[PDB]
Design a binder for this molecule. Structure first.
Ligand SMILES: CC[C@H]1OC(=O)[C@H](C)[C@@H](O[C@H]2C[C@@](C)(O)[C@@H](O)[C@H](C)O2)[C@H](C)[C@@H](O[C@@H]2O[C@H](C)C[C@H](N(C)C)[C@H]2O)[C@](C)(O)C[C@@H](C)C(=O)[C@H](C)[C@@H](O)[C@H]1C
Ligand code: HEM
Length: 393
């Protein structure tokens, strides 16, 4: 059996290609059903009645975690998402550009000629913007990275194991307790921020209870930084592999959003996602029973030649983007933060090119280590300044 790990990208991609070819719907040794083709991934994600986002159905003795937007289906999903949806509109998000650019430019200006992109910018920018979105203070950013890292590196094998779900609860316990305390504070003294908005909202004619609002806040915080960090790293790493694009972008900065969409397609931060079948069903003629877990490979769908011509060629001129960006999901759970992620990464890339022209990855620096699981990225990305304002006579 054995799915290759995320850390060896080449091995993983090769394995996905063979599966698209020879076993596009595959049951693994844990009874988890993997879906590899673009068209079938779209089918699964669109059909929420059959493919629930709630994992707890197949986790022995588990009950739903209340307030977890990413685990709730229609008709309940609409009402929860409506609580926060206006916080994320393009017009509202666009107002954040000056703040994002200020943070990015200040962070980059203090970097030497050799630095870890992750510690300098990719982590601090997204954690700052999400903390600010939630009304949280800067002193707490380090806790956020520690808690995220613990979750991302949680010991995991079988994803239906109730011991995993329990372990996840334990790891998030401090973060959730912290946010519950902040929810309580906002009920007593509300602000413009997202936590205030969520604690004062009505869903089904009643406020979210304390547990629901703390869990909802925990999901918002985690969603708001981890993948943005991963993508910005993947952007520079991917440009480094296709560096003719550094000059094309310097010459025409209006190319950057297209570069971002294409890096998303090429290296999705979150390469797979899970659903659970609510009834006996079928994917591409393959019978799947009721009450099992299904794993959709966004990464495999994005490299599927039936969907993308020459799929392993990095090509910003491809027409794909907007709501068709599968790396943000598809259908009802399509990423709420998508405009915000696109803006943060656009600004980051503009400022990188503004200051440095290009960054070269130092591929032999031992801090360059890929994540082993869950996300598709590197924990650090040691880089070297192409040029910078620091260079003298
Ligand atoms: C709200 C939208 C985000 O959801 C989460 O962050 C939620 C809160 C996480 O949920 C946790 C908490 C929980 C109690 O709800 C639990 O039931 C599930 C299994 O794990 C994500 C689904 C979680 O993913 C899950 O982590 C588990 C430890 C393992 C699981 N599978 C690989 C089995 C993975 O999906 C990550 C690590 O936050 C993913 C991030 C990095 C994204 O990239 C995603 C793009 C991520 O940012 C979004 C999916
Ligand atoms: C490049 C960076 C990002 C990527 C790749 C990404 C990816 C995704 C994906 C694939 C989903 C759907 C999960 C599913 O269908 O099960 C999702 C959902 C979500 N994302 Fe993002 N995300 C990014 C940034 C953000 C940011 C900055 C925010 C702001 C908080 C955010 C908030 C959310 C929320 C609230 C959901 C759940 C939506 C719902 O279930 O209705 N995301 N994200």
């Amino acid at each position: 059996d054995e799915v290759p790990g995320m850390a060896d990208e080449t091995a993983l991609l090769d394995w996905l290609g063979t599966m698209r070819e020879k076993q596009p719907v595959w049951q693994d040794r844990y009874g988890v059903w993997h879906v590899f083709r673009h068209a079938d991934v779209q089918t699964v994600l669109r059909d929420t009645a059959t493919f629930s986002s709630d994992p707890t159905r197949v986790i022995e003795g588990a009950s739903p975690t209340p307030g977890m937007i990413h685990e709730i289906d229609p008709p309940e999903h609409r009402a929860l998402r409506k609580v926060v949806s206006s916080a994320f509109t393009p017009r509202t998000i666009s107002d954040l550009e000056p703040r994002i650019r200020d943070v990015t430019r200040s962070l980059l200006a203090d970097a030497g000629e050799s630095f870890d992109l992750v510690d300098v910018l990719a982590f601090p920018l997204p954690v700052t913007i999400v903390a600010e979105l939630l009304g949280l203070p800067p002193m707490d950013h380090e806790q956020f990275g520690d808690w995220s890292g613990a979750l991302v590196d949680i010991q995991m094998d079988d994803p239906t194991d109730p011991a995993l779900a329990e372990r996840i609860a334990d790891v998030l316990n401090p973060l959730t307790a912290y946010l519950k305390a902040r929810c309580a504070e906002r009920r007593a003294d509300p602000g413009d921020d997202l936590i205030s908005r969520l604690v004062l909202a009505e869903v089904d004619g009643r406020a979210l209870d304390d547990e629901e609002a703390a869990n909802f806040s925990t999901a918002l915080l985690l969603a708001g930084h981890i993948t943005t960090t991963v993508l910005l790293g993947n952007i520079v790493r991917t440009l480094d592999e296709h560096p003719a694009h550094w000059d094309a972008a310097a010459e025409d900065p209006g190319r950057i959003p297209a570069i971002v969409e294409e890096v998303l397609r090429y290296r999705p931060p979150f390469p797979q996602m899970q659903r659970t079948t609510t009834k006996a069903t079928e994917v591409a003629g393959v019978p799947i029973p009721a009450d099992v877990m299904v794993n959709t490979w966004v990464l495999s769908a994005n490299r599927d030649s039936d969907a993308h011509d020459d799929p392993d060629r990095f090509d910003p001129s491809r027409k794909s983007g907007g709501a068709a960006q599968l790396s943000f999901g598809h259908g009802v759970h399509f990423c709420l933060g998508a405009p915000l992620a696109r803006l943060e990464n656009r600004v980051a890339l503009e400022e990188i090119i503004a200051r440095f022209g290009r960054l070269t990855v130092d591929r032999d620096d031992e801090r360059l280590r890929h994540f082993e699981q869950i996300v598709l990225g590197t924990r650090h990305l040691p880089v070297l300044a192409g040029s910078s304002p620091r260079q003298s006579a």
